[PDB]
Design a protein around this nucleic acid. Sequence first.
DNA 1: TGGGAGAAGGAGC
DNA 2: GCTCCTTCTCCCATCCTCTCGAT
RNA 3: AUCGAGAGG
Lengths: 112, 178, 53, 53, 45, 112, 127, 43, 49, 65, 134
Amino acid sequence: NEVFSRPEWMILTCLPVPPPPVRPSISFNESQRGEDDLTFKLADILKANISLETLEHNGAPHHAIEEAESLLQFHVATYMDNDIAGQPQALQKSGRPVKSIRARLKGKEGRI
Amino acid sequence: SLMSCISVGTDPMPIITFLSEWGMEPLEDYVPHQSPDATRVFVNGVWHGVHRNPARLMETLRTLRRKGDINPEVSMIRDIREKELKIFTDAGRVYRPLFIVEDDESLGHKELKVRKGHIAKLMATEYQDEYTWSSLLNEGLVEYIDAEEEESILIAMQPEDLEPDVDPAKRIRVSHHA
Amino acid sequence: NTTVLADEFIAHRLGLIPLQSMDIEQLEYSRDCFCEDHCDKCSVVLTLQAFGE
Amino acid sequence: KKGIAKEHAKWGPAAAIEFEYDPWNKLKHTDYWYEQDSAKEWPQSKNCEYEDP
Amino acid sequence: LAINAKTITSGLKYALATGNWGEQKKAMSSRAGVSQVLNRYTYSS
Amino acid sequence: KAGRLAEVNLKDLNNVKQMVMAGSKGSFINIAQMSACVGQQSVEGKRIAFGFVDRTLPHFSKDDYSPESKGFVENSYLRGLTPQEFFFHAMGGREGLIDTAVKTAETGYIQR
Amino acid sequence: DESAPITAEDSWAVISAFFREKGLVSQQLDSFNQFVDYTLQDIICEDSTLIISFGKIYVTKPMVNESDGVTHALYPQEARLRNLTYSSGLFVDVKVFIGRLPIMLRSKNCYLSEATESDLYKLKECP
Amino acid sequence: KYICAECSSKLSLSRTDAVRCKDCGHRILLKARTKRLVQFEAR
Amino acid sequence: KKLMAQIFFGPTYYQRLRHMVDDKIHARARGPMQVLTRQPVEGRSRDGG
Amino acid sequence: MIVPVRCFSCGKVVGDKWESYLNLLQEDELDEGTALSRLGLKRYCCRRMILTHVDLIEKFLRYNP
Amino acid sequence: NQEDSMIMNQSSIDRGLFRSLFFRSYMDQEKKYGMSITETFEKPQRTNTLRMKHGTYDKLDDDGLIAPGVRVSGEDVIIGKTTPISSKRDASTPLRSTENGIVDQVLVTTNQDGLKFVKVRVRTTKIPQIGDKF
DNA sequence: TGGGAGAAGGAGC
DNA sequence: GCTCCTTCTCCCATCCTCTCGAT
RNA sequence: AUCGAGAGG
Ligand SMILES: Nc1ncnc2c1ncn2[C@@H]1O[C@H](COP(=O)(O)OP(=O)(O)OP(=O)(O)O)[C@@H](O)[C@H]1O
Ligand SMILES: [Zn+2]
Ligand SMILES: [Zn+2]
Ligand SMILES: [Zn+2]
């Protein structure tokens, strides 16, 4: 659609980050608090983006810029879909896979 | 079940050194010719060799197990229609004890090895608070049989069943009396 | 109560003990007595003291 | 405290009150259950000694 | 000295207290159903 | 036919017959199984198969195809079940619990 | 009166003897006892040389390492009440302390296995 | 007002006194029983 | 009065099970809610719906 | 646990017939039925109260506290 | 008694048929949350603590515990403790909302870390009632 | 993880 | 150009409820 | 909160 859906918009250049209500900091028990999975994944996105910015400012060997771009692509892909077939899953500190938005919207326990 | 146990594990080597002395032929010096009526002797799933005249080997192994030389939790299976002798010694096998029936040619029909004297000894030992379960096991009166070995035995439900006006309310028992 | 039985267990067992009641007609009901939880014309007080000597 | 067995069974002084009437089945208030004979399968109560068959 | 005992202890104390029969970093092996809290509602239980 | 012969010759004051006559609970099969014979035990639509080699239980000889050998309970609940018939009845009745916890999900998906 | 055939009643003497010797939870007590006595040493000895070489292993009685205190004996009731762990230290004759193995109750390494009914009542353990 | 499992010292055990017993070196305590009279309905 | 039907009567061994109504009864009147979806929380112990 | 006082089915006191029951069983060598009948327990609702009872209290009395 | 239900004799229930004892054990520790920090088992104050549970604190002793023999019901506080900040926060443990009883025993013990913790056992009788399963 | 689709890539006339 | 043609990737799998653990 | 277990219709 000319107005609502163009092919050029299927490649992400600027990514919207949701407000805190979408990713609240759950505080169970008394002192056992922790940020949401989406907050950690977005922090990883920011780290990868800053890494690419630093490498470009440094004009790092293209063979390292390519690896940094692949890391950014993997992190922004797992952010929206952690169930990609034939690829390793991104894991939290505890060793469990992150709960992407696709996993939040899918299944009998999903939003819908 | 109440009378089901799990094997704990036993060293198979003492069994193997028996077989080589009982007349088995090592798989190295085995040619699949000149011996078509020969049994494949396995141990713990390993085809250790080939042995002829398996009846004597099985008789000797059963005599050893019903005496304590072989661990009573060792299951020995002979399947004639494939000519395979399978001895198992590993751990994790579920077995249950049950009585042993002998021919007892003296008293006509086949009769249980364990008799009322052993029961009297067991009751005296219980009431003496010598003759324990191990004493029954070591005398060949009771044997451990697992699921795989059950495919080569015939079991009678009750001692009265093997024994070779009528209450109408008693349950129907076929008593085919094999 | 140092015993191996619960307080309310013993209370229930005590409540089931048959007590003499030939002259029950002379006592008053607790609901109808201008008294308190214990009295003399509407209740009878008993005491149990036991020690495992 | 004074009380009745309605509030709690601890106040009931009647252990068991056997109650029977018409030992023979004259009034036909009961239809006896039988397999082959109804007079030989049901035991004859003691109070049958006090009424004419 | 020079031997880390905890690796054994905290190992054997974790799976046995959780049921995940393996290290805390592994989730493939038979897990969560190996060690269970003893049911003492009744002697038969 | 055995159950029908039993039910016909049951007196009218029989309490289980009155429940069947009213239709409140119980049926003909209940009369047959509690008074005449439990019947044939079948699992997965077929009679008891040979779990062992050429037999169903270690107490039967091989190559035995008699009805008693493959799960025919000649006894009633009043008379009591023999150990072989008891085990065959347990095998048959376990299927009635599997399709309650396993095959219920295959008909709920249909309705969804 | 010595070789008469058995009746269906006398087999209960055999079953009573079986349950008097084996018990009801022998299928777990005999498996664990094998692990401590034999399997543990086999695991220790197998490929244990860093060519350093581990050797004999010793399993003590269950004990608790009290904070700033002397290590004393631990009984199952004390472990249950204090939220402790019923375990015993393993010392490898490289004898270096390598860890603590939890001990199964009424096993060969448990005190309750060498306790009579009076001792079990004294230890506040149900016989 | 505190009784150890082994022996019954019936110590005081204030803030400073902490958790322990005199006679026996055992580390569990039961804090006696309330002085207030309880009342159960015998039913 | 006598009953026309004689009643099967006798001792039988009965067991009390862990399930009792005082441990199953529940009712919610706008209690606590979740922080993520702002829906009623789950569980009788949590005063949920 | 100790002794079933009274009788759920009827209400007869059977809490004072335990030691006598044990003495009849042991000292007088009578069987359960004759001992139960000699204690005046005619109805089988009272009879089961003393016949089927586990005196666990003794075991609870074997602990130090 | 229709549809697989039963009629139970109320008089027999009054005499002890199927009555039972129910014990529940609550546990509470105090932990360091640091190197030189420690929680305290004490009676919570009304002005110092930063939090409250709206339960009745009139039954706790000086140490923040309830002696055996006190009828604790509903939202009563049984193991009252206050934790500091890193004035004081509230970390008291109340009873279950739908559970009541009498305190049976109170075990005061030291943890393997040397930290004082307390277990409290509450005892209740569950008389058979309409709707109980047999 | 157990069957199914549907889809895809490949051979053959 | 069908003709398939076998070979692959693919998403599923009843409902509601309770309690107790371990992090 | 997460995870897992067990249990009821
Ligand atoms: N897996 C399940 N899925 C859906 N509903 C179930 C499930 N299991 C049980 N139920 C519900 O519970 C009921 C089963 O009742 P229950 O288990 O008491 O057996 P029943 O049919 O009542 O016969 P009985 O009481 O004699 O066993 C069904 O009516 C059903 O609605
Ligand atoms: Zn008064
Ligand atoms: Zn002391
Ligand atoms: Zn009675």
